[PDB]
UniProtKB/Swiss-Prot annotation, chain A:
Function: Self-assembles to form an icosahedral capsid with a T=16 symmetry, about 200 nm in diameter, and consisting of 150 hexons and 12 pentons (total of 162 capsomers). Hexons form the edges and faces of the capsid and are each composed of six MCP molecules. In contrast, one penton is found at each of the 12 vertices. Eleven of the pentons are MCP pentamers, while the last vertex is occupied by the portal complex.
Localization (cell): Virion; Host nucleus
Span of the entire protein shown here: 1037 to 1086 of 1381
Subunit-level organization: Homomultimer. Makes the hexons and eleven out of twelve pentons. Interacts with triplex proteins 1/TRX1 and 2/TRX2; adjacent capsomers are linked together in groups of three by triplexes, heterotrimeric complexes composed of one molecule of TRX1 and two molecules of TRX2. Interacts with scaffold protein; this interaction allows efficient MCP transport to the host nucleus. Interacts with capsid vertex component 2/CVC2. Interacts with the small capsomere-interacting protein/SCP.
Protein name: Major capsid protein
UniProt source species: Epstein-Barr virus (strain B95-8)
Gene: MCP
Family: Belongs to the herpesviridae major capsid protein family.
UniProtKB/Swiss-Prot annotation, chain B:
Subunit composition and interactions: Interacts with TRX2, MCP and capsid vertex component 2/CVC2.
Disulfide bond sites: none
Family, per entry: Belongs to the herpesviridae TRX1 protein family.
Highest taxon above the source species: Viruses
Subcellular location: Virion; Host nucleus
Function text: Structural component of the T=16 icosahedral capsid. The capsid is composed of pentamers and hexamers of major capsid protein/MCP, which are linked together by heterotrimers called triplexes. These triplexes are formed by a single molecule of triplex protein 1/TRX1 and two copies of triplex protein 2/TRX2. Additionally, TRX1 is required for efficient transport of TRX2 to the nucleus, which is the site of capsid assembly.
Protein name as annotated: Triplex capsid protein 1
Range covered out of full length: 1 to 61 of 364
């Protein structure tokens, strides 16, 4: 535990889980909705995925 | 005054009508419907192993 010629600065990142409050004013965005679909893909020897 | 000059258009229309339709995909969904016999068509898989009756073979295809 001799002190070497140099000293060191240490950096470390710490993280915190939090609960947030969000506010969003009235009629602030307009949305355009299109119709949904149904599609077939990847039929295997036992099953079919949609 | 209608000179026969090639294969009749009207007959080939009938024969290409059967080859045209491809397999169905991409059906759109309506909760106002919430289900359709059309969705069944897209979903059904329509398999083999008939019952050996004279018509049950034809019904199954």
């Amino acid at each position: 535990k001799i002190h070497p010629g140099v000293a060191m600065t240490v950096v470390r990142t710490d993280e915190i889980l939090s609960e947030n409050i969000l506010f969003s004013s009235r009629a602030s965005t307009s949305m355009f909705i299109g119709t949904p679909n149904v599609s077939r893909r990847e039929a295997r020897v036992d099953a079919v995925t949609f | 005054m209608k000179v026969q000059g090639s294969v009749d258009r009207r007959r080939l229309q009938r024969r290409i009508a059967g080859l045209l339709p491809p397999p169905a995909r991409r059906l759109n969904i309506s909760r106002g419907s919430e289900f359709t016999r059309d969705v069944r068509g897209l979903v059904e898989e329509h398999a083999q192993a008939s019952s050996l009756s004279a018509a049950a073979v034809w019904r199954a295809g």
